[PDB]
Amino acid sequence: VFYSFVLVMKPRQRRFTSQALREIGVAVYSNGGLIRSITNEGIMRPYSRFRDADNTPLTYARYIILQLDMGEEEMGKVDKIIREHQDVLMALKLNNLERPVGIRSGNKELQAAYFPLDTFTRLEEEINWSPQTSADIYTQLEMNWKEFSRTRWSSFLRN
Amino acid sequence: SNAYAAMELAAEARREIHELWLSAETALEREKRVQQVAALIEKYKLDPSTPREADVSRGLGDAFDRLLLLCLPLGKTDAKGTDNLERLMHLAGRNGRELSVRTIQHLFARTDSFAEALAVFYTMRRCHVAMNMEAYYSMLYSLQRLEEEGWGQHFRNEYEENGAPSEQAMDFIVKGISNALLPENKPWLGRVMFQDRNVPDRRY
């Protein structure tokens, strides 16, 4: 992934959030960029209540992961569009996607010994792992799991 | 019993390929040899349009490399020997196996002329097969040695009728081929590449 954003948005109506995401995608595509992915993560209750433009503390918020491939000047344009949006309370810019964290400030001998195509070609869920994600889930995809998981409920149906 | 029956005829596929390879008769006619390997392709369905789950060629292993150099040299008049080579190389490029250095050195050793070796080069370029960097350098050295013997037959064809060599024939003896990957006027272009520190020299 070239760039990723975690958009925290106000839980408005469906049409307002749809228009906000549509304007964000239009600003991405008009500057000559590509959307790798956009995923909605539902409404969760954060540990800190963000304030909107009219200084109202919001208890709930919607999280959206946005993975993009854009040029850096155009990414600055889209970031200035996103950070000045009325519905976006907070959005961090994941700029450590091509190079992993700890290489630049870590060991000096282990600085040019990495491969950027290892991290650039995979998605953001394969770089920053979720708690439900693990290596055995990745090995299950290449092991022909359809012919093996058909017998996993043969003991629980009778009890 | 799908996987057991797939390896039942595959062990028979490795056996009957080894039957006509154990012959290895150079006195056998090439027209009688390219019809036997063409019958073996249509028998075991070696076309890459076969479904890959019931593919019998992935179970051949090292016997597939002996089948690849079995269709060489090809027929020049019928121009159908390339079809026996292209069906095996499109399948080899689909399965993604590397041809070894000993295989390609034995593949271009069975090539008679310079025109047939360019057919093998542009078939494996079209079929997108993988190999080692030594396998590419030993291939282009065989293309270098096949053009050199082609001019040696030409400059002796004019020597037998004229009785004396020309100045261009004697200049071919000293210089030889100018444009070459591994020319003889700089004998150090195969030391880093090859593990044996020596260019393989074939004789007839």
């Binding site: 055995d136 090995t139 299950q140 290449e142 092991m143 022909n144 799991w145 012919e147 093996f148 998981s149 017998t151 996993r152 409920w153 043969s154 003991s155 629980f156 | 996987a3 490795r14 992935r58 179970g59 051949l60 292993g61 090292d62 016997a63 399965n95 196996r97």
Partner: protein
């Protein structure tokens, strides 16, 4: 000690057999697993004699191991 290529092979085979035995078959009372695991090893060496592939040999070995566990 153990040979390191055999170490990597046993690591891959154990990681791929633990998922088919635990989550796949849901069979925890399996007896004498060393004989099918060494049969997996010896079938892998039988397929590496002819030198077919790497992943496809693991596929056929896991299919034979699944059939043996079903039997």
């Amino acid at each position: 000690t153990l040979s390191p290529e055999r170490v990597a092979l046993r690591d891959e085979l154990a990681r791929k057999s633990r998922l088919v035995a635990s989550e796949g078959m849901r069979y925890y009372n399996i007896f004498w697993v060393r004989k099918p695991l060494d049969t997996m090893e010896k079938e892998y060496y039988e397929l590496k004699r002819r030198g077919v592939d790497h992943g496809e040999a693991i596929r056929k070995v896991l299919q034979g191991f699944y059939s043996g566990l079903a039997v």
